[PDB]
Design an enzyme around this catalytic site. Structure first.
Site, PDB file in Angstrom:
ATOM      1  N   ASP A 134     -57.825  18.121  76.207  1.00 31.51           N
ATOM      2  CA  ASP A 134     -58.386  18.816  75.402  1.00 31.51           C
ATOM      3  C   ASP A 134     -57.929  18.959  74.020  1.00 31.51           C
ATOM      4  O   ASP A 134     -56.424  18.931  73.894  1.00 31.51           O
ATOM      5  CB  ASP A 134     -58.420  20.329  76.001  1.00 31.51           C
ATOM      6  CG  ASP A 134     -56.862  20.696  76.567  1.00 31.51           C
ATOM      7  OD1 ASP A 134     -56.580  19.923  77.470  1.00 31.51           O
ATOM      8  OD2 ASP A 134     -56.546  21.691  75.805  1.00 31.51           O
ATOM      9  N   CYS A 137     -67.239  18.114  79.022  1.00 32.57           N
ATOM     10  CA  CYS A 137     -65.953  18.472  79.403  1.00 32.57           C
ATOM     11  C   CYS A 137     -65.838  19.844  79.821  1.00 32.57           C
ATOM     12  O   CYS A 137     -66.370  20.270  80.611  1.00 32.57           O
ATOM     13  CB  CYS A 137     -65.000  17.943  78.150  1.00 32.57           C
ATOM     14  SG  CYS A 137     -65.521  18.460  76.422  1.00 32.57           S
ATOM     15  N   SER A 138     -64.894  20.490  79.070  1.00 28.14           N
ATOM     16  CA  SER A 138     -64.889  21.946  79.561  1.00 28.14           C
ATOM     17  C   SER A 138     -65.945  22.742  78.887  1.00 28.14           C
ATOM     18  O   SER A 138     -66.786  23.467  79.465  1.00 28.14           O
ATOM     19  CB  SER A 138     -63.504  22.381  79.261  1.00 28.14           C
ATOM     20  OG  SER A 138     -63.313  23.840  80.073  1.00 28.14           O
ATOM     21  N   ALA A 139     -65.669  22.716  77.721  1.00 29.12           N
ATOM     22  CA  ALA A 139     -66.740  23.569  76.667  1.00 29.12           C
ATOM     23  C   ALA A 139     -68.066  22.667  76.146  1.00 29.12           C
ATOM     24  O   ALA A 139     -69.158  23.398  76.232  1.00 29.12           O
ATOM     25  CB  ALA A 139     -66.389  23.988  75.329  1.00 29.12           C
ATOM     26  N   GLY A 140     -67.834  21.286  76.342  1.00 27.61           N
ATOM     27  CA  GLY A 140     -69.059  20.440  76.138  1.00 27.61           C
ATOM     28  C   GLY A 140     -69.348  20.138  74.701  1.00 27.61           C
ATOM     29  O   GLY A 140     -70.513  20.080  74.571  1.00 27.61           O
ATOM     30  N   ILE A 141     -68.406  20.233  73.793  1.00 29.04           N
ATOM     31  CA  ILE A 141     -68.657  19.794  72.537  1.00 29.04           C
ATOM     32  C   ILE A 141     -67.482  19.163  71.738  1.00 29.04           C
ATOM     33  O   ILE A 141     -67.856  18.038  71.067  1.00 29.04           O
ATOM     34  CB  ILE A 141     -68.596  21.372  71.687  1.00 29.04           C
ATOM     35  CG1 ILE A 141     -67.503  22.154  71.873  1.00 29.04           C
ATOM     36  CG2 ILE A 141     -69.951  22.137  72.110  1.00 29.04           C
ATOM     37  CD1 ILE A 141     -67.326  23.469  70.881  1.00 29.04           C
ATOM     38  N   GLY A 142     -66.176  18.962  72.170  1.00 35.71           N
ATOM     39  CA  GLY A 142     -65.192  18.216  71.526  1.00 35.71           C
ATOM     40  C   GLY A 142     -65.132  16.862  71.902  1.00 35.71           C
ATOM     41  O   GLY A 142     -65.635  15.796  71.048  1.00 35.71           O
ATOM     42  N   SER A 155     -66.938  15.851  74.282  1.00 32.18           N
ATOM     43  CA  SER A 155     -68.212  15.204  74.718  1.00 32.18           C
ATOM     44  C   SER A 155     -68.987  14.805  73.148  1.00 32.18           C
ATOM     45  O   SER A 155     -69.554  13.862  73.153  1.00 32.18           O
ATOM     46  CB  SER A 155     -69.123  16.265  75.191  1.00 32.18           C
ATOM     47  OG  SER A 155     -68.634  16.646  76.650  1.00 32.18           O
ATOM     48  N   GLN A 165     -64.336  18.883  67.845  1.00 33.39           N
ATOM     49  CA  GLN A 165     -63.436  20.140  67.572  1.00 33.39           C
ATOM     50  C   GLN A 165     -62.374  19.724  66.664  1.00 33.39           C
ATOM     51  O   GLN A 165     -61.648  20.995  66.144  1.00 33.39           O
ATOM     52  CB  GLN A 165     -63.034  20.825  68.867  1.00 33.39           C
ATOM     53  CG  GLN A 165     -64.210  21.579  69.399  1.00 33.39           C
ATOM     54  CD  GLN A 165     -64.762  22.601  68.488  1.00 33.39           C
ATOM     55  OE1 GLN A 165     -65.569  22.445  67.674  1.00 33.39           O
ATOM     56  NE2 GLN A 165     -64.395  23.808  68.632  1.00 33.39           N
TER      57      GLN A 165
HETATM   58  O1  VO4 Z   1     -64.015  20.850  76.557  1.00 30.99           O
HETATM   59  V1  VO4 Z   1     -64.015  20.502  74.703  1.00 30.99           V
HETATM   60  O2  VO4 Z   1     -62.734  21.516  73.639  1.00 30.99           O
HETATM   61  O3  VO4 Z   1     -63.499  18.660  74.860  1.00 30.99           O
HETATM   62  O4  VO4 Z   1     -65.678  20.814  74.079  1.00 30.99           O
END
Ligand code: VO4
Length: 297
Positions: free
Chosen positions: A180, A214-219, A221, A261
């Site tokens: 992360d 991934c966890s949030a689906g933005i970084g 991903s 991110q």
């Molecule tokens: O779970 V992320 O901080 O790569 O969107």
């Protein structure tokens, strides 16, 4: 031109400023459905929501909400579904979305536990003999096989709609060493993994959009999708100079907030695309060079 620009930015040590500029210019659209009181337990993170205009709707009469966005890249002619790591109560929704959207692959860029906390539910079966039934959505999920490498695992799942008994093969591509807010170990390691997704057929236009999380689906991903789209764009044109990495990212951010991110993930995205360009422009041998450098054994 990305390589020239890349070194200009490195020269000045100005990646934070460049990345900040993208944050400032990024689209702002409403996420009213995500913020509804009844959807509070369907969101993993308070500050990461799908825009209403691009959100994936489940085909159910009760509550059609899932934290997932369709990234529809018109010029590149490729779509992705970016979503959060499913929660214990949204695993049925997640597989319902895979079914209804006709996806063939799921790309998972996180581990279930990272830094001592649970970043993602165990939404797929870890053992052949212990299949999963999601009763709320009437789906059954079976592990068929698994190919474990040093930093990634590829799984062959069977997804069955119990209502119709139709069954589909889902390919699960699991990057297990990408932290992360971190970057992959090398351009080679990332590209080796990206080309195995491409070499599965999961990104083909005859399938639904690949699901990326991934966890949030933005970084992570966002990083995965930006590199893929940029390589596809220059592949269509066979013209590496026609690709503007920052404009592609801004275009993607019209469909989901917060894609990439950190400034080093943006910098890594340049690296991956520049290196992948060698393959696009005819040096096929680089692909086996990446596999060697990635040390997947
Ligand atoms: O779970 V992320 O901080 O790569 O969107």
């Amino acid at each position: 031109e990305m390589e020239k620009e890349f070194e200009q930015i490195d020269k000045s040590g100005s990646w934070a400023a460049i990345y900040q500029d993208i944050r400032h210019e990024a689209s702002d659209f409403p996420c009213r459905v995500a913020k509804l009181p009844k959807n509070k337990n369907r969101n993993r993170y308070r500050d990461v929501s799908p825009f209403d205009h691009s959100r994936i709707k489940l085909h159910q009469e009760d509550n059609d909400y899932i934290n997932a966005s369709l990234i529809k890249m018109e010029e590149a002619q490729r779509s992705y579904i970016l979503t959060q790591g499913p929660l214990p109560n949204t695993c049925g929704h997640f597989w319902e979305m895979v079914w209804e959207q006709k996806s063939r692959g799921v790309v998972m860029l996180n581990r279930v536990m990272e830094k001592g906390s649970l970043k993602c539910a165990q939404y797929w079966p870890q053992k052949e003999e212990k299949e999963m039934i999601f009763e709320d959505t009437n789906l059954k999920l079976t592990l068929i096989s698994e190919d474990i490498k040093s930093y990634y695992t590829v799984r062959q799942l069977e997804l069955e709609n119990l209502t119709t008994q139709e069954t589909r093969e889902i390919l699960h591509f699991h990057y297990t060493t990408w932290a992360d807010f971190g970057v992959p170990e090398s351009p080679a390691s990332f590209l080796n993994f990206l080309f195995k997704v491409r070499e599965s057929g999961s990104l083909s236009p005859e399938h639904g959009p690949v699901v990326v999380h991934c966890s949030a689906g933005i970084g992570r991903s966002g990083t995965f999708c930006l590199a893929d789209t940029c390589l596809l764009l220059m592949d269509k044109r066979k013209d590496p100079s026609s690709v503007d990495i920052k404009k592609v990212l801004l275009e993607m951010r019209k469909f989901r907030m917060g894609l990439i991110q950190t400034a080093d993930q943006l910098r890594f995205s340049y690296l991956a695309v520049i290196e992948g360009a060698k393959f696009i422009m005819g040096d096929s041998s680089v692909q086996d060079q990446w596999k060697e450098l990635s040390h997947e054994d």
